[PDB]
Structures are given as C-alpha cells and as structure tokens.
Design a protein around this ligand. Structure first.
Ligand code: ATP
Ligand code: ADP
Ligand code: MG
Lengths: 178, 175
C-alpha cells in the first residue's frame, strides 16, 4: 500500500494508545484495499484526519513577565486593569508550575478593545490564535460535526480543523454570547 | 471479559443482567466500528459503570457529626443544631429519607458548603448539580439512544462518579 506507509511516517509524533490502536485498525482495514473509490476513501479521510490532528505537540509558552507586559503595551494603549489581570493570570500559572487554562470573559461597551486584546494576549503567551463567533450559530454541527457515515461530513471543523495549527495549546477566543 | 469481571465484582440485579447479556449478544452479531457498534459500546460501558448493589456505610453518630460540623465551618450554631436534630430524628426513624432539607439565606453565606459538610458527617459520597433555568428534562433523565447526542444525565453521572448507590445529591439554586 502506498499511502499506508506515508501515514505511518507522518504519525511519528507522540500519540496516545487509544488513538493509536484506532489508527492501526483503520490502517489494517484500508490495507485490505477492498476497492479504490468509496469505502477506501472514507477510511482514508478518517486516517488523514487522525494523522493530521497533532498529538502531544505543544508551543513553548513565554514565561517572562517582563516580555509579556512589554508586548501587551506594544499592542494596546492602557487597559490597565485588564493587563494587570492578564499578568496575574500568568504569574499564578508560573507559581502552580502548570497552567489551568481558565476561561476569561471580557464584557463592556462596543469598540472598547475586547476582541483585539485577545490577539495581543495570544502573542504575549506565545500561543497560536483562533477566533470563533458563536453568535448566529444555530446548528451544533459547527462545534462538533456529523458522524463519518454521512457523505460529506467534515470533522466538526471549527474545533478539530482548529487543531490543525500544529499546537495543542492555542488561545481560542469565543467572540460573543448572542 | 472486562465487562464480565466488572459485573462480577458487584451485585447486579437480574433484569439488568438479562438486558446486558442481551445487548452483548446483540453486539455478538458483530458490526465492527460503526454507529451501531459504538452505540452498543457506550451503552454497555455506562451499564458496567453504574454501581448496582454496592453502597457506602453511613454514620449517624451525633458525636462525630458534631465534630465534623464544627471543624468544617465556623459559627452557624443554629444551623448546626438543626442538622444535628435532623440526624437524631433520622437515626430514630432509621430511614433518613423523609423530608428534603433546604437552606436559604443571603448570597455568600456558604449554604452550598453545608452540603459537603453534611456528606462528610454522614460518610456519604458528595455530588452537586445546579438548576438555573434548565427548562429541560435531559439534564435529569437524559436523551434517547437514537439521537446523536446520547447522554445518560446528571443522576447516572452522579452514580458512576460516586460508585455508590446511596450518595448525597445537593441541588443548588432551586429558586
Ligand atoms: N485601548 C486601545 N488601544 C489601542 N487600540 C484600541 C484600543 N481600544 C480599541 N482599539 C482599536 O479599536 C478597534 C475596536 O475593535 P474592538 O476590539 O474594540 O472590538 P470589540 O471591543 O469586540 O467591539 P464589539 O463588542 O462591538 O465587537 C480595534 O481595532 C482596536 O485596535
Ligand atoms: N461559616 C463559614 N465557615 C467557613 N466558610 C464559610 C462560612 N460561610 C461561608 N463560607 C465560605 O463561603 C463560600 C461559599 O459561599 P456560599 O454560602 O456557598 O454561597 P451561595 O450560598 O451563594 O452558594 C465557601 O468558600 C465557604 O468557605
Ligand atoms: Mg468583538
């Protein structure tokens, strides 16, 4: 099989055991090569998604409070309490030795610097950035898509296709609460 | 099997055993790694997860109850006295299941921590789930297995987490 060894070469990164046995069994099912169009390609796409979602991949966070404060200042003019809370959030994690990934909600009048301070924070913590907009989201298939049995199902893109930033700790901004 | 030793350790009821072996034979007509396979897999996992006879021994002792209550909280002498009265009445009656206790008062007085203190005092397993405008039953009873969103619900999740047939369930913010 041509693509089998290619997928095997791709998934060299640290994969948990359950994902690994699932992808091994999927490789074994596709290795039968029962056909070349329909049942081959559904498992092929499942395999490509499994090998594309990065497992154990991280991004070296910036632990330097001075640099984080500097870059917040470069981005925005003084949102003093906001930036103090971001720095205190960084310091509590640097104390606990491992972060907790707390959910922070920013509320206030329009145009006050809510959405862009998120990109600022992402650059400060050396994470990858990504932006939802849940307002006007009416179907659940956006956060988690349709099962693979349906014809054109996408892997619940806005969360899993998010993970194709090659990083397990990206900062995700959920835009609104409408 | 994993599920077999699971049910072998704990006292299963007869109808449950019948249904689980029925669904296990229904999977025996293998439909490997599909929707109708993973549905059966999750069903049997929840079934072997639920504790069936195993429970936690209680402690209706007033002395230890008082010690726990005075340790976990400061002040609140009258609430502690009401809790001790409930415990004594429930020891007499033996059932400890008659009327539901409900603490009310201003916010921030720690009426949610009294539930944890009571769980410690009765040596039960604690569990909390809030009801703020849920408007649905799927939180309590859950969903059907047909829906792609298939969850047992708050009660079964409490049972699977506590691994105990007689836990303490706090219900927050009824009002
Ligand atoms: N303190 C600030 N310093 C520098 N630029 C700012 C500041 N506040 C707002 N801006 C700029 O003004 C624009 C306003 O966008 P903003 O991020 O405020 O949208 P928002 O707060 O999400 O508004 P809405 O809630 O209406 O969507 C941004 O492009 C931002 O660059
Ligand atoms: N008498 C007390 N002793 C110890 N902690 C208390 C006391 N009263 C309140 N608390 C604290 O208050 C917090 C819980 O507040 P709570 O009364 O549960 O608010 P709400 O009633 O709105 O849920 C807990 O962290 C608890 O430690
Ligand atoms: Mg915005």
């Amino acid at each position: 099989a041509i693509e089998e060894k290619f997928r095997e070469r791709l998934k060299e990164l640290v994969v948990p055991k359950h994902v690994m046995d699932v992808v091994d069994e999927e490789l074994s099912k596709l290795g039968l090569l029962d056909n070349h169009s329909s049942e081959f390609n559904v498992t092929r796409n499942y395999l490509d998604w499994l090998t594309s979602i990065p497992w154990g991949k991280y991004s070296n966070e910036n632990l330097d409070l001075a640099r984080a404060q500097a870059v917040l200042e470069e981005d925005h003019y003084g949102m003093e309490d906001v930036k103090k809370r971001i720095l205190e959030f960084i310091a509590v994690s640097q104390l606990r030795g491992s972060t907790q990934g707390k959910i922070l909600c920013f509320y206030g009048p329009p145009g006050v610097g809510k959405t862009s301070i998120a990109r600022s924070i992402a650059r400060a913590l050396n994470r990858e950035y990504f932006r939802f907009s849940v307002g006007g989201m009416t179907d659940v298939a956006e956060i988690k898509g349709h099962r693979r049995t349906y014809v054109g199902a996408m892997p619940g893109k806005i969360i899993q296709c998010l993970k194709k930033t090659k990083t397990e700790n990206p900062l995700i901004l959920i835009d609104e609460v409408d």
